[PDB]
Symmetry: C3
Subunit: 282 residues, 3 copies
């Protein structure tokens, strides 16, 4: 891990002394969900490039910014653009922000992402709640906590069986009903793979047998580092596409179909998030 404890501090202090805002909730906007930034009030923006020790984005969208502000009466801080393993970043870079948020005072993390549908009942547009995850990269060694443990942040062997806040999962289901949506809120397991290429048919079959409901290439590292931190954790997935599960098909997965899905569910996603802010205890 190239980051000493001081690096985390220095980044925190720099931000603390560059904004009067003091966030409680950190939000990581997944693919095509960055619109949430609009709903914040008194929004103060900071590009990653200007933030000391921040993994400088390669050439994805060049619009990696930390947007502070208030969302439904809640001191937030949003990441509009995130880092992934498939871009070449070591997991201690992918998750460097989460520890910065902690030192800033945040005590709750909301992670959102786009993912394929493994559960056959799911459908494009659906919003699966994350009850649990399967960290395939972690089994093999790729775990953000790898290396000497910094007791200052947390313990050597933190548990993950209680990763996703039960309360939040329950309160989010409520809010959804108090929205009268046709499609019932979904809930399940999120499996992470590194990507960047898409699953073959055989691969999807594996992921289903494993018991995964949806598949993405992010989130899990951030969640793990968060939990090791003491942060409360809630998150969901926007089922942007159903994974191909038969060879007699004539369909393929593509960034187009995925971004298009994000595009439509755009505002519906924002509403849901904004409202839920009221459920986060103080």
């Amino acid at each position: 891990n190239g980051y000493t404890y001081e690096d985390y501090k220095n980044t925190a202090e720099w931000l603390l002394s560059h904004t009067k805002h003091r966030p409680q909730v950190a939000i990581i906007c997944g693919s095509g969900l960055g619109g949430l930034t609009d709903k914040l009030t008194q929004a103060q923006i900071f590009d990653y490039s200007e933030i000391p020790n921040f993994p400088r984005s390669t050439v994805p969208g060049h619009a990696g910014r930390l947007v502070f502000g208030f969302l439904n009466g809640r001191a937030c801080v949003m990441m509009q653009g995130r880092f992934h393993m498939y871009e070449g970043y070591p997991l201690w870079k992918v998750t460097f922000p989460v520890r910065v948020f902690h030192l800033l005072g945040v005590d709750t993390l909301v992670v959102t992402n786009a993912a394929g549908g493994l559960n056959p009942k799911f459908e494009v547009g659906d919003i699966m709640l994350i009850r649990d995850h399967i960290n395939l990269p972690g089994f093999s060694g790729q775990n953000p906590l790898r290396g000497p443990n910094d007791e200052r942040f947390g313990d050597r062997f933190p548990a993950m069986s209680d990763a996703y806040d039960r309360t939040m999962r329950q309160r989010a289901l409520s809010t959804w009903k108090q929205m009268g949506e046709q499609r019932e809120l979904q809930e399940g397991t999120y499996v992470m793979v590194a990507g960047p290429s898409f699953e073959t048919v055989a691969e999807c079959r594996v992921l289903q047998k494993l018991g995964a409901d949806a598949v993405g290439m992010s989130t899990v590292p951030e969640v793990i580092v968060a939990r090791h931190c003491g942060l409360r954790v809630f998150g969901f997935s926007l089922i942007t596409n159903k994974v191909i599960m038969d060879y007699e098909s004539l369909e393929k997965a593509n960034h187009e179909e995925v971004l298009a899905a994000g595009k439509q569910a755009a505002q519906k996603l924002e509403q849901f998030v904004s409202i839920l802010m009221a459920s986060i205890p103080l």
Copy 2:
């Protein structure tokens, strides 16, 4: 990825200006199948050592050569000796040739390899056709496409559900009948593991439950980079041994038994490949 786009170009140009040949089909000869080199006509040889930017072979067989020529009226280019992950090479080295082939003008890749038999119906000598693969290393992070994407070669998130050419799979089955072989042509899923040690009994059981038919320690990376390239892809496996699946057994897997299998199926493999060349569209 240590290779810039220029490196690929320079290697391509060097080859282009060092041979009058202009290949359409690239062939990667798996373990003990390198004999195919004999069947080429007007065969021009190039050792990897002399080819700029080519991963220089460690000390496997020191006979890593790129052999250009014609095979059954088809401008080929064969790799007699390939690179593996277990030898320590990063996947962007293991698959550097595939992108060189592309810039040379190749538009079809034939991958062959030796592998164990997971499907219980399989037998030593069998020739399993590859319908699909399970990229275990990829799930964890080891994917040749890892790092910044070079739009010049392909997209950021390429699909793999349609990796192995349907047409070719069908036409290869034909050719086999027009050979009157006792054993029917086999077809199935190829699972990749990094090796270099062999699967335990428990491990084989896992691979079978995953739904894999055969297991090897190569190919998948090359296929992925190929598909990201637009190349058509066909490939097969020479079931050189049945994996041990019971503890009451008294059998072990070894390079001897594997090379011996390659040795007998040697010519039979060549015939099949050479003929199929006629099925590859122009």
Copy 3:
């Protein structure tokens, strides 16, 4: 692999000329089982820090020592404190001792460790014998043998289906009866994951479906390098905790509960090991 063959030699020679002892059996004491060191007679201690080329322990317990001596009339050598992947060590460091033991003359390796219980019949305190393992990190690339093979130690593609000595497994069962323990000796498959965080519920379910009986974050690399060496291999697991397998639970895994388990089964573990020494042929 940062270690040349000379490095192994130099370390061996240094030890050979620093102790009159010449071990036959090497013992790797897992978590909370390091007490075995007491039972040795004519015990000569060597801290890792003083041993050339030895992976210098970071800041776990600072008590990494190689303790030579006799155990039940058997020239031993024990590792009180081991290296793990989650601490950041490359597997060729984690397993550097095993090859040092070989050059010292050892021909048998006993590996012990603490692990969670996947098999539902298991219970805290139980002692599962290792019949086989599932090397998840290995599938993805993390295999101690990765890189150029040193024929001097062993072959390029060693088998692992016969990793755990049948004889020993049988003789250990005997010894246990000749102990009249209430709980029958357990036996099964050990699955390795890198850690350092604990499995989620979904993760445990995966490991069970894979067919694993217990889960830990070590051992497998050492075993593999041992077998590639020609060493006989025996080992067991102290089921220190049952992994959480339902979401309706209110239990978590922690280093406290694990070390506490090691603490009670402490001596019972030693007795078993010490006695078994007599079963190891000469």
